[PDB]
Enzyme design. Sequence first.
Site, PDB file in Angstrom:
ATOM      1  N   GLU A  57      40.439 -22.069-104.068  1.00 34.51           N
ATOM      2  CA  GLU A  57      40.021 -23.538-104.104  1.00 34.51           C
ATOM      3  C   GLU A  57      39.654 -24.000-102.988  1.00 34.51           C
ATOM      4  O   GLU A  57      39.058 -25.113-102.907  1.00 34.51           O
ATOM      5  CB  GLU A  57      41.223 -24.104-104.707  1.00 34.51           C
ATOM      6  CG  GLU A  57      41.736 -23.880-106.259  1.00 34.51           C
ATOM      7  CD  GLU A  57      42.895 -24.514-106.739  1.00 34.51           C
ATOM      8  OE1 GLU A  57      43.390 -25.232-105.888  1.00 34.51           O
ATOM      9  OE2 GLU A  57      43.396 -24.136-107.827  1.00 34.51           O
ATOM     10  N   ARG A 116      36.098 -35.947-101.335  1.00 29.59           N
ATOM     11  CA  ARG A 116      37.512 -36.030-101.965  1.00 29.59           C
ATOM     12  C   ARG A 116      37.403 -36.948-103.190  1.00 29.59           C
ATOM     13  O   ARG A 116      36.821 -37.880-103.250  1.00 29.59           O
ATOM     14  CB  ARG A 116      38.494 -36.622-100.944  1.00 29.59           C
ATOM     15  CG  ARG A 116      39.884 -36.662-101.541  1.00 29.59           C
ATOM     16  CD  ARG A 116      40.804 -37.450-100.861  1.00 29.59           C
ATOM     17  NE  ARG A 116      42.204 -38.020-101.507  1.00 29.59           N
ATOM     18  CZ  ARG A 116      43.129 -37.238-101.769  1.00 29.59           C
ATOM     19  NH1 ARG A 116      43.290 -35.860-101.401  1.00 29.59           N
ATOM     20  NH2 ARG A 116      44.265 -37.641-102.671  1.00 29.59           N
ATOM     21  N   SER A 136      43.957 -33.533 -98.371  1.00 28.20           N
ATOM     22  CA  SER A 136      42.929 -32.451 -98.763  1.00 28.20           C
ATOM     23  C   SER A 136      41.571 -32.693 -99.166  1.00 28.20           C
ATOM     24  O   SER A 136      41.350 -33.742 -99.750  1.00 28.20           O
ATOM     25  CB  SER A 136      43.408 -31.511 -99.746  1.00 28.20           C
ATOM     26  OG  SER A 136      43.747 -31.814-100.896  1.00 28.20           O
ATOM     27  N   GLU A 141      40.266 -25.457 -99.757  1.00 30.76           N
ATOM     28  CA  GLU A 141      40.562 -26.664 -99.282  1.00 30.76           C
ATOM     29  C   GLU A 141      40.488 -26.759 -97.752  1.00 30.76           C
ATOM     30  O   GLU A 141      40.687 -25.943 -96.819  1.00 30.76           O
ATOM     31  CB  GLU A 141      41.832 -27.137 -99.664  1.00 30.76           C
ATOM     32  CG  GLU A 141      42.335 -26.942-101.110  1.00 30.76           C
ATOM     33  CD  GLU A 141      43.595 -26.774-101.477  1.00 30.76           C
ATOM     34  OE1 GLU A 141      44.440 -28.155-101.589  1.00 30.76           O
ATOM     35  OE2 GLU A 141      44.316 -25.937-101.539  1.00 30.76           O
TER      36      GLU A 141
END
Lengths: 185, 103, 103, 103, 103, 103, 41
Positions: free
Chosen positions: A107, A4, A58, A109
Amino acid sequence: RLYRADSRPPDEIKRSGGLMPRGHNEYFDRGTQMNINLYDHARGTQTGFVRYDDGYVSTSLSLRSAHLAGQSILSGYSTYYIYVIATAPNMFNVNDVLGVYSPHPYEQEVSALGGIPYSQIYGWYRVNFGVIDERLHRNREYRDRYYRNLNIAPAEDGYRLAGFPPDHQAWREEPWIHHAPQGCG
Amino acid sequence: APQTITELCSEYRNTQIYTINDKILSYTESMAGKREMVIITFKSGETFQVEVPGSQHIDSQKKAIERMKDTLRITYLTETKIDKLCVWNNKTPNSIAAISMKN
Amino acid sequence: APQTITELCSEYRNTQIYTINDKILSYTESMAGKREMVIITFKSGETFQVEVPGSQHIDSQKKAIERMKDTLRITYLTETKIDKLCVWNNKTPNSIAAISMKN
Amino acid sequence: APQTITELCSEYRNTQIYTINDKILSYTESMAGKREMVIITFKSGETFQVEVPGSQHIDSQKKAIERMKDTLRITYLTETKIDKLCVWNNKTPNSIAAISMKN
Amino acid sequence: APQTITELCSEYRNTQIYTINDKILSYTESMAGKREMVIITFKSGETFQVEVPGSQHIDSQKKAIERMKDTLRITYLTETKIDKLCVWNNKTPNSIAAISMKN
Amino acid sequence: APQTITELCSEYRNTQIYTINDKILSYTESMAGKREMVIITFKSGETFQVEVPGSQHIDSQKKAIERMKDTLRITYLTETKIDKLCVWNNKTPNSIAAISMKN
Amino acid sequence: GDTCNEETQNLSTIYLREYQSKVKRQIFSDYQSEVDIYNRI
Ligand SMILES: CC(=O)N[C@@H]1[C@@H](O[C@@H]2O[C@H](CO)[C@H](O)[C@H](O)[C@H]2O)[C@@H](O)[C@@H](CO)O[C@@H]1O
């Protein structure tokens, strides 16, 4: 391991108890109940912060992807971090759970319900003027024995936690129907 | 008065200092008769014990034996690196006399 | 009764406050005969000890000595920040009398 | 028997209830002769102590004084919020009679 | 010997199993003369106590009373779920005789 | 002294090694008269007990019994995997003589 | 209202509190100090 991008520094995260979702002050902090919803978290793009709204934080599956987000998100910052996170049951693959209604699909996540406790963070990299320093800093407080054998929560368990609004069709289709909360479907 | 573990270890006969610098691999605890002891080993292959309280121990060492066994259990569980050990080498496994932990 | 470590420290001769504000660097524990004690060290180089119970202690200190040793092991293993120490400066290393932690 | 701390506190003379609802700010433990005690404080400025065992204590309180010092140390370390304290107000700092914690 | 808390619970008079399957809501501890005891409650409104040591207690129970309070204290802080309780219903609050935890 | 749980276990009659390789599933603790004990069970179905200190126990074993019960409580809470157990299979449930764990 | 979404909210909090307990069982156990009962009693 998941990664992250975050402007928030190690010492701040340590005081907070981990990577906290938007609004939550201390990891364990009760009383001040916040809205915890997956579907609402997933559609919520935030500037200044990688998606961390609605009781979820996320993460990304690789250093590169997390780095891509920090680039466009933390674009302004002269120094930010990419934390290396261990997999555990508090995390859900947004794509696997939300399915067809995955807000931003390509994406890929994986969101941690309620944040990411400090003991689950393995280490982090510093990023200067947008360039990763290839020196990971191990978090001395990472619980190795504990997190060693843990993994992400299977989508099965996330289904009822899917957060879809009352109607959303999913509640009337596979496999959200087999798991719809008392008032969904 | 000793300021460090190596200084303390030198005040005794039949002791060796071993620089371990690693966490304990296994912990074994026994309550069986005449075998009330704790055994620990390391990835290096080294095995150490905490002797059963016996006639070679003064009354002051009695409470100290319990504290050492308490320390080995918690160090194991928390995965804490042990720095050095002072041990009596006239025993097998070698008997623990003092422990040290750093950082 | 005293309400602070400083206040408490001052009721004794041969003592002084050491403003630490840091975690323990190393922890050494010994069960060797006549030297059952604990020694801690700080990044500053300051080295303190918990004394082997002897005559210098009154009976009520017996239990407080054991507790202090329990307290220092926990603080060390958890990297808990120590605030200040009250030490009897007439020993080498300086002997610990009280500890205070904050925040 | 009492079903709550308020109800239990009310059976003693010279006691009062403090609603803390906050974690401990600092912890002080002392093994100094005649001052073998623990002192805690809150951001509100409150300071309370667990008294040094004395003639005011019946034999059955001795093991409870000990348990109480253990409780305060771990409550401080875990930053657990204290709800209420029943204290004897004829001592300075006020003396702890009972503690309650709520989750 | 028994193999479950229910089995064990049924070897005594005046007992009964309560299935709790919940963490402790509040924890109360007391060092007050004649009230050295612990009291716990659940969000279900049930209140239980660990009785003050008395003449209804046989010597082997003394060590056990102490251990129970240690367990209740750590169970409370960790928010660990109590499964069942075996309790004597001839006391107010009901007296805890045994406890069980799962998962 | 033995250097292994297996070697140690073999020194006794009516013992048997169980290879567990898993965490405790449930923990039961009792303070009921003549039943002061801990019973543990695993997912695999095995149930074991640390027995009641009786005439079948030597003095040095009373302290070791308490220690074992402490160990069982903490390993259950931390969900730590037990590797092996040496048990006396001449009882129901089998009694624990020693425990081993590794990582 | 307290139909579909009161559920998701209450279900999510439930999963979280369970996890948070697993965490406390890890980090808070480091502070547990064992007592010599025979010395206490
Ligand atoms: C070297 C020696 O034989 N020393 C004697 C002591 O023995 C040592 O004692 C420790 C425990 O204190 C441990 O068991 C060592 O392995 C052992 O060799 C002991 O018997 C004491 C008794 O006063 O003095 C001896 O000199």
